[PDB]
Design a protein around this ligand. Structure first.
Ligand SMILES: CCC(CC)CN(C[C@@H](O)[C@H](Cc1ccccc1)NC(=O)O[C@H]1CO[C@H]2OCC[C@H]21)S(=O)(=O)c1ccc(N)cc1
Lengths: 99, 99
């Protein structure tokens, strides 16, 4: 679809069998979701931005459905202020900015 | 133009005669630029990032030119590591997310 930006570009995602809302965040290198239990081994990592860093659990090669489009990639889980879909998955679903 | 997300969506912007590199960021409610000494009055504000909040100065009705389109509105200024064009100005230039 084509999404305007008068409101936050929030979409429904499906990960680990759960439905959630996530923000399409072109300013995010990576995808960071709120605390949740996902199958498989995870590695401790830290990611930073405005304000500093937070500790996250890195899950690799995770299936995630974003607004009906499938992606398989790295998902970071931790105390993020909002669920954000970053460029690592936006690229997989063919997302671009246009004006 | 069409901006793919393989790399950070950085573009040249023009503000008050100066050229800067800035992120086209659908995850940012409001435009925020790196520290700069603007004239005029402002309102204190706090913005929430991945690592917590920082304090910024809010300026109103600031003109920024983005790839031939002129946008005017709220421009925050603070100790950010990158210049960010947020939704408040992206909407004015007709910017959409497409996949
Ligand atoms: C809605 C919550 C997000 C944080 C999640 C808000 N951010 C915009 C976001 O695009 C930010 C913009 C940003 C880009 C680069 C450095 C600092 C901030 N990117 C970001 O934090 O991404 C992190 C996750 O992937 C990694 O790649 C970038 C940092 C990591 S922000 O920078 O803190 C921001 C908050 C409020 C306004 N008005 C303008 C910007």
């Amino acid at each position: 679809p084509q999404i305007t930006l008068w409101k936050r570009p929030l979409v429904t995602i499906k990960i680990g069998g759960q439905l959630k809302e996530a923000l399409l965040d072109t300013g995010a290198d990576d995808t960071v979701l709120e605390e949740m239990n996902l199958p498989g081994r995870w590695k401790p990592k830290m990611i930073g931005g405005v304000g500093g860093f937070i500790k996250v659990r890195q899950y690799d090669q995770i299936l995630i459905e974003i607004c009906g489009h499938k992606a398989i990639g790295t998902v970071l889980v931790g105390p993020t202020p909002v669920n954000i879909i970053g460029r690592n998955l936006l690229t997989q679903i063919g997302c671009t900015l246009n004006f």
